[PDB]
Design a protein around this ligand. Structure first.
Ligand code: NI
Length: 341
């Protein structure tokens, strides 16, 4: 059965609620983004209206084969009426196609559902500037002060400089990048651009990328592995065995692998600055864990919420334990007492 934090009161609407069968009273199912924990349940057999972004709709049709008649893409930054209720989709700064949803309830209440997001000061100049929000359904993935990590731009600068130095010292090095979902495409795209190569990958991954409206993509990626010196592999292969096995398949073109594992936060962020990061190495294979986050840091979350000044907060992540719930509620009350709302 569908939990309360996925239901929007006073409406026929749910958000990211496809794993509970037919939800009683739901006339429109919203999908914030194409990540498996959120889309769980959708298929060619789904026969209710799905509301989402253009990019999410391309993924639903080509990867899950949802029929075209049930996919309802909405443009961003545009007031739209759905089943008699005004809604707006906003960019969530998460993965491609990911949105926040603003709902303007018939009784005068305004609700913001962040989906998954990485808060940014630029959100302070969206359509959110114009009015009050009574309820905030908040992505609380990293809602504790220990969760620190650098900007995406600093992490990409590190990756580019690391890859360009290695391959300039050894023109026979191959670069490998791990993936297991959409998001974080800048990691492999920026490295391939500095190196003058296309990114090589499986047919399945190429298909996924072709759904994402990335400008000039045909110039950036390929399924011809032999033409490419930046390869994508599933994340589970980014270890010394998997990489050894990969290097064998490359027909003596290469004599070294430099590999990247984009992660979220890890506990080595408590001690080591991005500049000072070192790899794990065995022989001619080196593996960098790089903390490229598509979720808000604690400080970015706190900034956004103290700017928005919501009347009530409903967390959507870390909701399963009394200790997690109690900790989040303590931070929400500090933020409110500090800022005065
Ligand atoms: Ni996500």
């Amino acid at each position: 059965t569908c939990p309360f934090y996925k239901k929007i009161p006073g409406t026929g609407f749910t958000v990211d609620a496809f794993q509970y069968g037919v939800v009683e009273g739901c006339t429109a199912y919203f999908l914030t983004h194409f990540h498996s924990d959120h889309y769980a349940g959708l298929s060619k057999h789904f026969t209710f209206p799905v509301y989402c972004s253009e990019i999410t709709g391309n993924l639903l049709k080509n990867k899950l084969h949802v029929q075209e008649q049930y996919i309802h893409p909405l443009p961003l930054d545009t007031e739209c009426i759905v089943n008699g209720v005004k809604v707006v989709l906003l960019d969530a700064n998460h993965c491609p196609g990911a949105v926040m949803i603003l709902f303007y309830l018939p009784n005068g209440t305004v609700i913001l559902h962040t989906g998954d997001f990485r808060a940014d000061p630029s959100m302070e100049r969206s359509l959110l500037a114009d009015q009050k929000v009574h309820m905030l359904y908040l992505d609380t993935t990293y809602c504790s002060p220990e969760y620190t990590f650098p900007s995406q731009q600093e992490v990409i600068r590190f990756a580019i400089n690391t890859a360009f130095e290695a391959v300039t010292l050894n023109p026979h090095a191959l670069v490998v990048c791990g993936t297991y979902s959409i998001g974080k495409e800048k990691v492999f795209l920026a490295i391939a651009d500095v190196l003058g190569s296309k990114v090589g990958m499986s047919q399945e991954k190429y298909k996924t990328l072709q759904c994402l409206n990335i400008p000039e993509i045909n110039s950036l990626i390929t399924t011809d592995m032999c033409s490419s010196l930046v390869h994508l592999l599933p994340m589970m292969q980014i270890n010394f065995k998997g990489l050894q096995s990969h290097l064998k398949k490359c027909g003596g073109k290469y004599n070294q692998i430099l590999a990247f594992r984009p992660t979220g936060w890890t506990h080595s962020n408590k001690f080591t600055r991005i500049a000072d990061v070192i790899p794990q190495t065995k022989g001619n294979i080196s593996i960098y864990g790089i903390p490229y986050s598509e979720h808000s840091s604690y400080l970015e979350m706190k900034r956004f919420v103290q700017w928005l000044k919501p009347q009530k907060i409903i967390p959507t992540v870390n909701v399963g334990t009394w200790k997690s719930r109690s900790t989040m509620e303590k931070y929400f009350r500090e933020w409110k007492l500090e800022a005065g709302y």
